[PDB]
Symmetry: C2
Subunit: 106 residues, 2 copies
């Protein structure tokens, strides 16, 4: 039921690296830990969008674990190819979009 | 298993209208028809992102039904508040992002 979407800028050509970095991380239990159930990466022009599906608002641990050594790697890894969308960005929480509507059919 | 994400530009302030337009459309069977299982709208700065979850690649009917009178309304409705992201846009398919990675945990 929980969905979050983060948006950054990326060179389209860097997608494969990006994908590769997660691929590896997603083989470990690091994510089942944080509580991630599904992960989808999209690209559109020079925008990168990371969709996370979970079972609860897991953002906090998410935010928590970034400073974390267990996650430096995936972070460096991914990080070298991503840039914050907006000029006023200070932290991770800043790349998170807002949901303003949600509908599930019966 | 099917996920698509469309991105356009929107004035943050127009969100409530946007939401209202779908709210109504989502009360009808019009979407259960097209095959939509879940719908989530996000906003980030002046970007609008529409996530559709389905059970198959439903984009074609999706694309099909736009010219459609059954869908003029929601379309006009929504449409007046959205603008194509990129300058080279010619059609709806052009607002669709690409998935470059997908992971589901066991």
């Amino acid at each position: 039921a929980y969905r979050a979407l983060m948006v950054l800028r990326m060179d389209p050509a860097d997608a494969e690296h990006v994908a590769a970095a997660f691929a590896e991380h997603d083989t470990t239990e690091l994510p089942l830990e944080i509580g991630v159930r599904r992960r989808v990466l999209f690209r559109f022009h020079d925008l990168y969008m990371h969709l996370i599906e979970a079972d609860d608002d897991i953002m906090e641990r998410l935010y928590q674990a970034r400073s974390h050594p267990l996650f430096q790697e995936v972070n460096e890894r991914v990080g070298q190819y991503l840039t914050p969308y907006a000029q006023d960005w200070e932290e991770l929480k800043d790349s998170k979009a807002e949901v303003f509507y949600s509908w599930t059919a019966p």
